[PDB]
Amino acid sequence: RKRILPTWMLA
Amino acid sequence: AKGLFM
Amino acid sequence: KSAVVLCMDVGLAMSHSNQGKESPFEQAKKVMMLFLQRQVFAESKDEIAVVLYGTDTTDNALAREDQYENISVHRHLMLPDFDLLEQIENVVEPGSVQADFLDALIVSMDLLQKETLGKKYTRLHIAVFSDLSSPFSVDQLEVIIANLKKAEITLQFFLPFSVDGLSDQQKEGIEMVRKIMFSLDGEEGLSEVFTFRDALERLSIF
User: Fold this and answer.
1) Residue ranges making up the domain that contains C96
2) Total structural domains in chain C?
């Protein structure tokens, strides 16, 4: 299943 | 020791 | 001061008993209760948060359509109090569903990252209580681990069994947990997976 992480976890 | 036992 | 998030599984299966044994929901509760009151009566400066996954209600910041469902924030990051003890002791009840524990882990990581800005904390920790009998998606797992390392968030798991009558999903959860913990600290990381019985014993000495 697709998951959308918070933006801060993508820095 | 660490965590809850900290 | 340290920040600790108690990530408790409150899924349907947590209420299942075997041979008259205490349900893991009760076992996890006893561990959480013993830890909390130990922090309260000790005047500890550590702030505690409580996240629940498996609740019939969804109440978290990241909740969206098919995203972080059945995950509820019971207590935000702050000092533990007698109200929290009453809540954990008699208010928190098990749910009828099974939530993704990795979604719960993310919520706990987001709760710390958002509610720890500026404030100086010596340690960030997340303690997970679960029987691992809930399905979960592994999407972007490597990102979750990297953020745990980048954010210096240690991790602990507390289970109703040792790593050895388990269900298929439970066996799948074991491997995922061991995979996560080994990537974080190797052998020392594997030793951070305890049983409710063992943890209760350690929390009764000084």
Assistant:
1) 2-203
2) 1
